[PDB]
Design a protein around this ligand. Structure first.
Ligand SMILES: C=Cc1cc2c(N3CCC4(CC3)CN(C(=O)CC)C4)nc(OC3CCN(C)CC3)nc2c(OCC)c1-c1c(C)ccc2[nH]ncc12
Ligand SMILES: Nc1nc2c(ncn2[C@@H]2O[C@H](COP(=O)(O)OP(=O)(O)O)[C@@H](O)[C@H]2O)c(=O)[nH]1
Ligand SMILES: [Mg+2]
Length: 164
């Protein structure tokens, strides 16, 4: 059984917890306590390989130890929160710093696609991920659009970087 350490990052309110809950439990949550940071588990056979996903859902204060052993990063913004999207450059800079690498397994996630009248357009997200050399996945923790893609793609990005 192969372990993968995943770290979900992004601003308050983007849907980090909701996306994780959708992965573990296959249902959309309305609230979830913004003060809870923990690491959760999910066992899935991905491409014939029994995986144990260790998904750290971040929260708390505005630490290198935890982040340094992250193998892949889910960088999440909400498509109706321009600031959360603009924040992604900061999170990427800081992740690179701690891995001392230009090539860190990373997936850019645009969450809340079920919400009307987005303020961050898919072109803006697609351009950013292209510039980073990383996949972009649009999600809705509400429908569940893209939730599997986001996590399975990150696992695959990790494999691409290193033997597992
Ligand atoms: C994940 C660690 C982290 C979080 C924040 C952060 N969080 C706020 C958002 C939540 C967690 C963390 C998610 N939460 C919730 O869901 C509850 C509502 C709270 N915010 C800001 O900075 C902000 C944003 C960009 N602005 C331009 C300036 C100020 N930086 C952060 C930061 O980099 C620190 C430089 C790091 C960080 C990284 C990536 C890498 C190594 C590191 N080691 N130690 C910190 C750190
Ligand atoms: N319509 C909609 N609401 C969402 C979605 N994802 C999260 N939310 C809501 O956004 C709010 C904050 O989400 P939460 O998962 O706590 O965000 P966090 O701070 O990143 O963990 C909650 O009320 C969620 O129900 C989504 O994909 N669509
Ligand atoms: Mg949360």
């Amino acid at each position: 059984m192969t372990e993968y350490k995943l770290v979900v990052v992004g601003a308050c309110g983007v849907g980090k917890s909701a996306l994780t809950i959708q992965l573990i439990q296959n249902h959309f949550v309305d609230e979830y306590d913004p003060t809870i940071e923990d690491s959760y588990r999910k066992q899935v056979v991905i491409d014939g390989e029994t995986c144990l996903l260790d998904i750290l859902d971040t929260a708390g204060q505005e630490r290198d130890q935890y982040m340094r052993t992250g193998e892949g990063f889910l960088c999440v913004f909400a498509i109706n929160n321009t600031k959360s999207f603009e924040d992604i450059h900061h999170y990427r800079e800081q992740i690179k710093r701690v891995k001392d690498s230009e090539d860190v397994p990373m997936v850019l996630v645009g969450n809340k696609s079920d919400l009307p009248s987005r303020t961050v357009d898919t072109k803006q997200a697609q351009d950013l991920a292209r510039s980073y050399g990383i996949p972009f996945i649009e999600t809705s923790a509400k429908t569940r659009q893209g939730v599997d893609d986001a996590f399975y793609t990150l696992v695959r990005e990790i494999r691409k970087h290193k033997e597992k």
